Design a protein around this ligand. Sequence first.
Ligand SMILES: Cc1cc(NC(=O)C(=O)N2C[C@@H](C)CC[C@@H]2c2ccc3scnc3c2)cnc1N
Ligand SMILES: CSC[C@H]1O[C@@H](n2cnc3c(N)ncnc32)[C@H](O)[C@@H]1O
Ligand SMILES: [Cl-]
Ligand SMILES: [Cl-]
Ligand SMILES: [Cl-]
Ligand SMILES: [Cl-]
Ligand SMILES: [Cl-]
Ligand SMILES: [Cl-]
Lengths: 625, 303
Amino acid sequence: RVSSGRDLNCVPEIADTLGAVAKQGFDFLCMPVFHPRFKREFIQEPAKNRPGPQTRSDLLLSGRDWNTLIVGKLSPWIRPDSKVEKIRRNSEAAMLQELNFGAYLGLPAFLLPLNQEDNTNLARVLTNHIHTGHHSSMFWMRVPLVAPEDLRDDIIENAPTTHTEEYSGEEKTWMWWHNFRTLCDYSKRIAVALEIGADLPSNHVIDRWLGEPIKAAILPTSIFLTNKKGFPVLSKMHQRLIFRLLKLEVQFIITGTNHHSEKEFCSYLQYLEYLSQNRPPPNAYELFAKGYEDYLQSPLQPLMDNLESQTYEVFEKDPIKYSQYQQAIYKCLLDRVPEEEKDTNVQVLMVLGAGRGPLVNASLRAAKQADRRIKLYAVEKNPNAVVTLENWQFEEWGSQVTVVSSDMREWVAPEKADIIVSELLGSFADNELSPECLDGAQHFLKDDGVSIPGEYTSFLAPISSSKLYNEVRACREKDRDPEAQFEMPYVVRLHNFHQLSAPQPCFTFSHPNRDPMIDNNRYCTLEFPVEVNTVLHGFAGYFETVLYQDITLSIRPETHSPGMFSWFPILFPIKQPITVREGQTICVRFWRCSNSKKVWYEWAVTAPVCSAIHNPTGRSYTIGL
Amino acid sequence: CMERQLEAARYRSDGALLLGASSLSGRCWAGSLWLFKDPCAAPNEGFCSAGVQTEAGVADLTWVGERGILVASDSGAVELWELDENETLIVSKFCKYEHDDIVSTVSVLSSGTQAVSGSKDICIKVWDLAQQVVLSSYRAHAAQVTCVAASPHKDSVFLSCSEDNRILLWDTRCPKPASQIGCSAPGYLPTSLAWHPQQSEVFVFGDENGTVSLVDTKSTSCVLSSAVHSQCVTGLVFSPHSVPFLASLSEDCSLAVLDSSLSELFRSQAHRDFVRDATWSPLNHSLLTTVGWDHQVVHHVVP
Ligand SMILES: Cc1cc(NC(=O)C(=O)N2C[C@@H](C)CC[C@@H]2c2ccc3scnc3c2)cnc1N
Ligand SMILES: CSC[C@H]1O[C@@H](n2cnc3c(N)ncnc32)[C@H](O)[C@@H]1O
Ligand SMILES: [Cl-]
Ligand SMILES: [Cl-]
Ligand SMILES: [Cl-]
Ligand SMILES: [Cl-]
Ligand SMILES: [Cl-]
Ligand SMILES: [Cl-]
């Protein structure tokens, strides 16, 4: 169920207040750490020398309570970007005082408002405070989904609400946040508290906040409608937004007074709980994937490195994937061996990269399903996995399966293969060097031999995620190029991001590749039409593969294989975010480069502005042959 | 006991002093209402006529006739306090939570049966003090409402100013009741509003820069202004005099009494914290009483 918080601007005494919101069922309380009306002077006498105390004592709650249950709020009179110098200098001193008192109490979060365009001085003070001792505390920037100026009632006679459409103008609230977080240099301690009004804007205004670090969603009591019974509820469009935020796994803050006087105040919260609780449980895939959401991992290199036993275990725990491989082989055997030849003709079947032999078992099931004879070879260069195969071979399989412990490009086969079955695909299809491996194994494939898969294609889509951009930025290591983290791909269950255009195909490979002049190097130019204002942070990578004829695997979102979690998407980031406004086309260039020892990718944005060429000479990232 | 920060100070027709107070620091952030038939005895608790504790602090206060006390609470409630038959007690008549943030300003309309409140929730509401309900709720402003001031004689007309830098004249007989005024260019934010007691269509507004301005709604022009205070002008109150004096309150911790041309006649540095409210004695029109966060009740003598 939901992790909820209460927002109050009136706390007569903290102990009774915190106890009350606890009974209501709130997990934390947002409150002022100084009385909101208690304006303080720091320069001009005599107000300067006001007798203390300046606020309530830290002894009123336990250290646990301050660390867990209390979220600080900046006093509303503090205006660091005032046009009046006196108010600026005083608000600067006031802001530091309240922030420093929050740090003193060890609060897990502190709320600061963005409710105008110019928050440059606010940013300067916050950035200075952030860079004064390494702390854990979060800063929730309170940003309205719609500016109060654009939400006001049309009741001013000589200043009417502009009924004319302004696409960029209706996104102004996002630009307030973007400018602020840019000034503060994408600090990981600065997140968004998105405040939602009674009237929701256009979808493009909401979609602007996809990929943004939203930690809180503020729901005023105003926006809640009333049913026949009298309980508070939300509109179908408001419910839609809650379900989008429940996926992002944000904390919900209730603000404003009780207007539904007849019923208890907990009713507001009980409704949010009802929404979240009445949702399809995760069950298969969803829960395993939920833990990995936006978790950056280095792509596996099963050729260069020997995979651990538990890495093969997760590969093996994908029944849909091996159901398909079985069906692909099942179909192929019926095509190659006529019914009358079933007892005479025995097909030579070679599993190239057998691991612990799930494809070996898939081959045996397919054979007796198809009612055809097969002679199995299990080729695996990982000698630790060969232990698993040879124990399988002695105990269960027998002579039928022949386990070969070597590289498929090196192995001298005693006979040629009718079918070769491989699993050498990464999240970007060819990023584990399936092409080079199957190319080297192609000599012991029969003149009319079949490769499973026979084809695979990589797909790229430009994405916006300030969240993921910041996670890549945090992967800076000592004893290497400070920007190396931006010049290498990551395998990540992409969650908090925004697809800016439909995925297009990048690189395709066919097997067998009978071409005399075999060159696995590639250069691909993709034109991505963008119909939204956004910021480009990288390119999401997927793949499709033809196992045999119509039997296919895909992690392409649009055509994704149902209930298959062997592969998460790949992410190709860029050093500098690129502004892309409505209508503009994103042009990305992708190279697949190689020498005798290494294979790598280079990539560059060429429109609407040029980026640097990423990973030149594979300096940051290489895939070992 | 009483709280340090004196917020409100208003004289009744019979010359009794009504004080509003808040605790803005310490353990408990509450409020209290006090009546003083002896105004010189104030602010001493032991020598008061009547006193009561409120759940939260009072941000603004006003009389409702002779026995009524309307309160702008931190809680977001507008609450009306009835005075005892014998004026020994102050009892709550209603407490309605209709604002979503602190109620910053209240003002009784000409009739005396209806009131208008301004809040940090950006909304202005019109109240029926008989039915104890909100007749109208307006979201005209784009930022927190600083001051609302009912016209002396017109029950459908009132002023409002906010941190969206708007000064709105209201007429609730129009389908679009708000009308934007102010000086030619976007000046410094308006902080205080006072209608002229005799001259209809004429009011004065103070800004956060310490300037007091005289404005005419008929001319809708910035006819006159003066740099009175060195900090934000938090209050403006006209005297009952035939040719009325204008008392201006500021966070510079000074009182300043001004003529019709906004020239400095009198000034007091008596307060050592912010000067919150000011009220003229109806018994002695020359006597002016101010209160501040220094817990002082200073009785001035204006020439
Ligand atoms: C069958 C197969 C499968 C894959 N699939 C993947 O690599 C993959 O997407 N994931 C993500 C998740 C499902 C856990 C396993 C694995 C992974 C990735 C990165 C690292 S870094 C340390 N552990 C790991 C695990 C790739 N190649 C082949 N051949
Ligand atoms: C099931 S993940 C792919 C498997 O193929 C194996 N593999 C990768 N490249 C080769 C190769 N050239 N020869 C043999 N096995 C390989 C890896 O060790 C892993 O077990
Ligand atoms: Cl302090
Ligand atoms: Cl929290
Ligand atoms: Cl975006
Ligand atoms: Cl394909
Ligand atoms: Cl290609
Ligand atoms: Cl090209």
